[PDB]
Design an enzyme around this catalytic site. Structure first.
Site, short mmCIF file in Angstrom:
data_model
loop_
_atom_site.label_atom_id
_atom_site.label_comp_id
_atom_site.label_asym_id
_atom_site.label_seq_id
_atom_site.Cartn_x
_atom_site.Cartn_y
_atom_site.Cartn_z
N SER A 1 -10.23 7.37 3.26
CA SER A 1 -11.37 6.47 3.31
C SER A 1 -12.65 7.26 3.57
CB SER A 1 -11.17 5.42 4.41
OG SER A 1 -12.36 4.68 4.62
N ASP B 1 7.44 -3.56 2.21
CA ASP B 1 6.93 -2.54 3.12
C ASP B 1 6.54 -1.30 2.31
OD1 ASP B 1 6.37 -0.76 5.16
OD2 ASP B 1 8.42 -0.69 5.93
#
Ligand SMILES: NCc1ccc(C(F)(F)F)cc1
EC number: 3.4.23.22
Length: 330
Positions: free
Chosen positions: A199, A35
């Site tokens: 992004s 994770d």
């Protein structure tokens, strides 16, 4: 030194991936969920309330000659879905794919939330975010990656998740045969303890690329892709009959539809998520309504590039003193 381990989807929808991890002496092998969105290594154990264990493999510290109780240390975690667990802390030897760390904090669950109990295939979590998020008190503990960093050939690990297929987590080296083209690296902010990056935009299907900054986290521990409401609405608008459902808790679409691909930007590079990756199947057995793999982050407060996005790429987690994230097509 280096390590390499195969990671395997737990079901036919790729809801999560498990990776075998050796804990203790002699080794006890548990299947952990790696994770990158949390920083605790916690396991089902002989100390977990018996009613809260349903088929998991448990870590038994009393059978490990190298286990040591970390006196007075406790831990308590709550995840983004209302998942929670807590317990005490041992140190022990932990090995992933041939890579061994001694004195790793192994957090032993005394109680786990029901969502973990019902998932018989996940024996625990191995956190790979930054150590500032570790929940051990009063003395915060380091992650497996932070402890291994000194011994690694390079301070990196890579995630190569498969679509309905096994994949690989590598520690300490970059497998140049696992991707195509070049790796594009992008800056990471550690201010919230996550692998947080920006992004450069997105496209739906064959549409034109929209340049816009989307700040989010790279999270192998989250199944879906959670993006701002404006982006998610533009995606599902291209799917005939798709709608946001209050009773289901997200966008659903007719199972007969074919889904468009989704492109996200990494610097000047583009990563394309095939439409098939966004299909998470019927909302209930026999239903003709299917659950979408791209959902709104509006209720979460942060954008999450989960497994749906990451499994479309080869992803480098560069833990150098200035951390970066690398993305390549594969
Ligand atoms: N995979 C761990 C995880 C789960 C939820 C969250 C968030 F976004 F809800 F805070 C972050 C990290």
């Amino acid at each position: 030194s280096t390590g390499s381990a195969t990671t395997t989807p737990i079901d036919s929808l790729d809801d999560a991936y498990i990776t075998p991890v050796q804990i203790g002496t002699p080794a006890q092998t548990l299947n952990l969920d790696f994770d990158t969105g949390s920083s605790d290594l916690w396991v089902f154990s002989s100390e977990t309330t018996a009613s809260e264990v349903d088929g998991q493999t448990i870590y038994t510290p009393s059978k490990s000659t190298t286990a040591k109780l970390l006196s007075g240390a406790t831990w308590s975690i709550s995840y983004g879905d209302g998942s929670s667990s807590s317990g005490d802390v041992y140190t022990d030897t932990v090995s992933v794919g041939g890579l061994t760390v001694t004195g790793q904090a192994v957090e032993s669950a005394k109680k786990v939330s029901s969502s973990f109990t019902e998932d018989s295939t996940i024996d625990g979590l191995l956190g790979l975010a930054f150590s500032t998020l570790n929940t051990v008190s009063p003395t915060q503990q380091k992650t497996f990656f932070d402890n291994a960093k000194a011994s690694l050939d390079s301070p990196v690990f890579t995630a190569d998740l498969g679509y309905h297929a096994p994949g690989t987590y590598n520690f300490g080296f970059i497998d140049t045969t696992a991707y195509t083209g070049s790796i594009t690296y992008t800056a990471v902010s550690t201010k919230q303890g996550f692998w947080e990056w920006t992004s450069t935009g997105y496209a739906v299907g064959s549409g034109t690329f929209k340049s816009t900054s989307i700040d989010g986290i790279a999270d192998t521990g989250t199944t879906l892709l959670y993006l701002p409401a404006t982006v998610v609405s533009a995606y599902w608008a291209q799917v005939s009959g798709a709608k946001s459902s209050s009773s289901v808790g997200g966008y659903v679409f007719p199972c007969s539809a074919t889904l468009p691909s989704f492109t996200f930007g990494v610097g000047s590079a583009r990563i394309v998520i095939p439409g098939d990756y966004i299909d998470f199947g019927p909302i209930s057995t026999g239903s003709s309504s299917c659950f979408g793999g791209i959902q709104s982050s509006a209720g979460i407060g942060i954008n999450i590039f989960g497994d749906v996005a990451l499994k479309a790429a080869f992803v480098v987690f560069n833990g150098a003193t200035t951390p970066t994230l690398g993305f390549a097509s594969k």
